Amino acid sequence: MNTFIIFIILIPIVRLAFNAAFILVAILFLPFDLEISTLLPYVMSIYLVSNYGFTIVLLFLLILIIGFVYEINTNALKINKHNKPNTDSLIYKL
Amino acid sequence: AIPFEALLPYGIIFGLLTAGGGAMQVLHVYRNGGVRDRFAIDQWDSQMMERDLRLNGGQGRKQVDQATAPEAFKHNHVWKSERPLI
Amino acid sequence: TAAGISLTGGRNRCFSEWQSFMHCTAKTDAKSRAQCLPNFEDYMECLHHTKEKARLREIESVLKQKKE
Amino acid sequence: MFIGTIILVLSFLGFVFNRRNIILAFICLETMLLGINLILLRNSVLFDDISGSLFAIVIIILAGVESAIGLSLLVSYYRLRGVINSYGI
Amino acid sequence: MLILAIISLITFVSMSKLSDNRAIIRLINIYLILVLVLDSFLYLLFLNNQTYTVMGELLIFNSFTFYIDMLIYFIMIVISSLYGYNLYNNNLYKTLFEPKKELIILFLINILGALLIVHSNDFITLFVAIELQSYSIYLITAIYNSSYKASKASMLYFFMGGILSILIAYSINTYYSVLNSYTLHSLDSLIINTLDLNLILIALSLGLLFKIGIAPLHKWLISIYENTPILITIYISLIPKISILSYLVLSNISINSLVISILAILTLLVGSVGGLLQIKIKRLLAFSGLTNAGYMMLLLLLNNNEFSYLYYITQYSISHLAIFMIIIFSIYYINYINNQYNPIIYVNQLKGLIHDNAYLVLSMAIVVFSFIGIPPLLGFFGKLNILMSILNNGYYFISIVLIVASLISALYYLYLLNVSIQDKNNILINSNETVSSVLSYILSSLIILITFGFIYNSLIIDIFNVYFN
Amino acid sequence: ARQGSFWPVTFGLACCAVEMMHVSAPRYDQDRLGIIFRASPRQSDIMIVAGTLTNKMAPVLRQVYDQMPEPRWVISMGSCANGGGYYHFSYSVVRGCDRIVPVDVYVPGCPPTSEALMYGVFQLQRKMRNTKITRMWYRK
Amino acid sequence: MMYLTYYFIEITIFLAILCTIFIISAKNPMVSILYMIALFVIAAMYLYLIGLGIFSLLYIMIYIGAIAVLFLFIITLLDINSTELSVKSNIRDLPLVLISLIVLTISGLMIYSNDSILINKLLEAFGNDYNTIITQDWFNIENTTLLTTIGNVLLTNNAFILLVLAIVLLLGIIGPISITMKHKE
Amino acid sequence: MINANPGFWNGPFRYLRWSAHNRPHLFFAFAIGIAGPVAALTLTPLRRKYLYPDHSPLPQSYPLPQRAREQLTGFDDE
Amino acid sequence: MIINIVEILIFLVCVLFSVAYLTVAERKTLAYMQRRLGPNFVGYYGLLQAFADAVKLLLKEIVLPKESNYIILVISPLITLITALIGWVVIPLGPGITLGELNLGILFSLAIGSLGVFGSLLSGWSSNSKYSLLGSIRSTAQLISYELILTSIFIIIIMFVSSLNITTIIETQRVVWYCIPLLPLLLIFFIASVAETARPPFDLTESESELVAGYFTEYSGSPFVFFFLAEYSNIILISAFNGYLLLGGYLSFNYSYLFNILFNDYSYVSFLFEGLINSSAYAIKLVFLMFSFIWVRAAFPRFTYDNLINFCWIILLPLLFGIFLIIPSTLYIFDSFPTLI
Amino acid sequence: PREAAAHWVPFEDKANMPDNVPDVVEVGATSAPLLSASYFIGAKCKPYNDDFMLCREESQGSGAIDCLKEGRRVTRCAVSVIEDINKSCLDEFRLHWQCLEQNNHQLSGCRKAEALLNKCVFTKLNLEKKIPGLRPDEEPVFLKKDPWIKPAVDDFKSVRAYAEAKKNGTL
């Protein structure tokens, strides 16, 4: 019986439409989360992988920045409006 | 600071957490027997603390400077018999 | 490529027998490779612990029926 | 070695004998991957080796990406049909 | 070269509208050709079968893998010309065959996953690469999300491919549980005989082989190849089979398996029998791909199987492209368009094609008789080598099943030719539109190779007796 | 507890909301007494029928009142809600919010001064302070 | 006192069985996802039991934190109909369910051993009888743990797999966009 | 429109001024990300030559000598 | 194990009482910023307001709507409180003066801040009505989109010190606090903290749903109370992450020369005065940052969901994936990669 | 190796060593004085420790049974070191290892007592601390005049002694 062990037990026991940016934000959270979680071993082995695993993780991050670039310039997460304001010109046949 | 009435509850919070941290310090110290708590202990430091428990009479973090060990030390050796994992 | 490495970043528990077996493979060609049998069996014993387990089962049988 | 095999088998059986919906199929896939990782990590401990944990972390990555792609594919199906009925794929 | 392609295309395509997609496909087509021309001299490194291990011991490079790499690129410069060069500049053929934006990226990523498999030396690289090849091909089926059947197809292929990736990983973890290794080079005659690994390795072979349609789990892949668009069917049907069969051939896993013998027999029987009543083209050609997967499965049991595999996989790929290309060209001369994605479905729509374009039918006959194994077409010299190897190693009942399967498959192969040389009312007499130049030259070149490549067989044998021996 | 935390619901404040908002203002802070206005009935105890209670609105009012969890009170702010006031003889008016809901305190005025509202709340706090919760059970 | 914590692994095995049956039997799928979360927790427990809390936490922050958030994020937005567990519809599978259970379990257990006689391959799996001694040595000098080792090998010995997982994640970005996002312009 | 894109190939420097004015949130991100690898390539040898050199590596394990054993004495029994 | 019970009860009392009076501190601080006063009538200067709101809500009906679930609306607030509370275990108030004292304390907090989302996820399923299930989705997308940005900062600073022990991370800040070399990360971490708690200027869903008939947290009784002891504790917790990551935690002026001058020996007085000084530095830092949550609330208007997801994935993430490259380069330039201890 | 997992009962062995293996005293010194004395031991037991690890390497599996003599000589060299310390430099050793125990065995918090100990043992036993593998350029961390990292609380007795010893010139 440790104080962490005593505490981690005590506390508990005492039709529609959607925009596809709503769903992409979740679907894209996965890979970016796996990237930032795969970066943990680097930060905890950063000395032992001196200057080799540094370069390796940079090529890793650059490859991932590519996909981020693709996401931005597609404008995936932007919401798009249908009822546009008219910008044609007013032209009268004579 | 002008508005003392607004800072009183901050004074409650400040004093409660303050006394909580100082009291936990004294409690950890009384647990250890007059020494500050250890932290970031690895395999080696744990194995050495167990070796201390073998040399002193199981008295926690009490240290001993003797160049020669009591004869119990040779027979107090422990191995650890683990359950098969499934 | 990451073979023979432990959880602490060092040599595993059964590495040494694997080293003897790999040495004797390098010493021998496919015809003479039969010589590597006991080394391989030692490796498998370190891994899976079968013959020692059966040894202990015999000991336990003697403690179990021949006394009661 | 036991718990992983059991989750794997029961989840394969619940994948195969699901006459109800599809989210059970996704779930059974994820549970199969879980049971694999537990088998492998048990063996990696007993051998005191690292290749098992490496393949485990790799499985976690690949399974998460699997679920991402699967749940985009489902969204495409739903785009076109509007209802994911019990016996449709 | 693939990687710099995939990296550059992501940026260059995000910067580019929907209207540049054809030109971007044309660019990567020419780039792949420049690779295959200028970096092809690296075959010298594999003199006397000098084999190299790379990135530690994760990858393996020998003459087998290099030739497979060139073949996958030759496939991928022909499969790209089909998207980047419009046949006819008509509104119908714009609507029928228009590339999407992300398609080409997924193709190259699938090329990468294909090549990491064949080049793999450790199971970890295999599991990473088969997941890459698998996920990319889930998306390729699904990219045409404006169709109902493709949506159904990608969903089924996802689930039934996930199950097999589970089976593969279960097998690998078992091998590691037994032996504390992820590398097959850690096997040898001693370890094979000494340890009961037969179950643990056939489970690998099956988990890889059921991903290519091996019987009796052929139906799901056949429903997919039928339900997906024709220009996707021509890619999904080939590249995954090359990759996985090549990995299983290079690694001499199943030397004399009884299970593999049984299943391979069943594939030849199923793929020959069940394709007789089919009225649709794609199901017919899928059952053809299955029986050819049967023939190529039969050399997983040999231990000296490189020449027979390399010659058959090459002629299979060539005939497979050419026949699907003939079917694509014939859409101009039919009367009814069935879909925006599958303009041609039923074999009875090719009726009278001789009276419209006869030399298209000459190409179809050459290609069909190549599939059947009529000499002097390349298919003869491919099925001959398989018969030499299995009879040299001791499979006799299987050779008879092989002969019987070829005869039975002549019937569904000749259904096309029979209806094509039939007679038709309302023939074509003139047409001011003209098919593209490049696609005609590609089809012709594949035809001329199927026809006359028997001339070079000795030269190929000499080169093989140096670089593979 | 019931006094020091006195949370009305945002509903009922249609007309004459200015004088009620002035009781949320600096010079007369209601939050100093623990008053907090809430969007939702289910967390609230008090309803303030300010302004005109029209016939097009009374059912919505009764819904919000039944949705409140007991204990619940009602306090009628203004004349237009006590007896209809100025629009008593109109076609589109309930001549009193009594007709719909039960009222505990009636603040007079049109618009009642912020001080009148605070005094009414101090009368309501007195009502609940001379309430018998358990002593009545010890009688019952 | 000692043996109060002896059978925790068997408890987790029993609990995983329960959560699997509950995932299979639940009416509304949302409940089935909650039971999947219970199963990932039990797995994290078991991994702590055998000395890998790092993976317990990585699981809780990957699977539960993202994948299951997403599964609820989907079933909240889609009209995923169902068919509650029944007896007219699913009883027919009982003989095949039972045969498949017995065979697949006994094979999954026999497979891990190298004995030549079949029955002994299973009786070896059922030989979990003997305790494993743990000795203490003094050769490890650093504070290397499992995560540091994983970083070292993954970023030095197996760099290629890392630089391929980057492309798997590029697929995870780029495929879902292509599928969901219609680049009409 | 008022401040649309002039194109990277129709004047780099003019594009860089436009981006710093209208899209800083990308420009300064690119500048940050390029300033690391580039400086690591360029400035590192200067720091190694002029400021201070690279440290001598850490033991990492018992440094087993590369020699053959020598016969010693002292501290024997008795 | 008696003193372990004493130490737990001290901690729980201190944290929960701090939460209760953070409610009052929020209200009085916000008031004086608005040139008013109060609560200052329910106690001796309002020091009993929070317990009055509680006791009123515990004597209130437990009312459940017709078409709702009971178990989900009940356990989900309870599990939110639990998950928010267990993050307090790894939080140090002195060098090793911690209940957990794990070697993976960062990862524990990071996994528990991932478990937190489920309260908002299960809220929308408490209402079978259709709009609530989209309002919860908006409020989940903000959290999972901003947890990427909080994490990324945990990793950026752990590049400086290669250990997941919280005490070790604080002890490396004797030389300098990591808010001086990475000052912009202080803003980013504080912005994202305010977002993850769904606090203003990031209170989109509670406001957008306060207008609508639902899509909010329409609970009552005890679940209200637990949700308001889980919001005002996740606030302190996220403020603590800022403290022990960037602001030195418990660190302060070197009290070497003073303790040398005044004591002469290591007694059970010096240990107390030391733990007082350490915790007081840790506390005043939490106070200034809780003040900052309130300061921000008093000023800035609200965001919309498009502006907010655009802020995250197009402005913050690029800067961070840039910083991921500049800092390892900055260490490689100078031969200063940290060791594992 | 690994640590115990999921369950583990300590178990001893009440038996004695074989008669063909002679008897050797044990060091009997705990973590802190041992860590203080590490450098003085290594400066004196270097050849013996090296011969021990070499015979372990040459044996190739039988190290536990072939290296007993070498481990015995190592243990005796260590005992001679600590006996020389306790006989001669006791109080300074106690200052060092108590200053350590009131920290996390970080040597940075004990530099004053470490200085007094190095001085005394160098004057009497002729044993100096040395960190090898360094260049002549690198400055060893225990001799830096104004280090970046300093203890939370400099120990009291250590500080009084350091000041009195500078006044007495002993340092």
Place this chain on the structure above:
Amino acid sequence: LWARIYLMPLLQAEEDRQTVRRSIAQLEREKEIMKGTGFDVDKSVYNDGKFHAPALMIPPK
């Protein structure tokens, strides 16, 4: 590190001696449990003639 290095050989010597004592006493124990039987307990399951600590035992109870 260099301090923990200068200490390693000493401590591992201790552990080798206790390893020897226990691994030999275990065999002298089984000899007495296997008195009247032709079961060689000294016969090593390893075919090489190296020392090998048990790595297994019987549960104490």
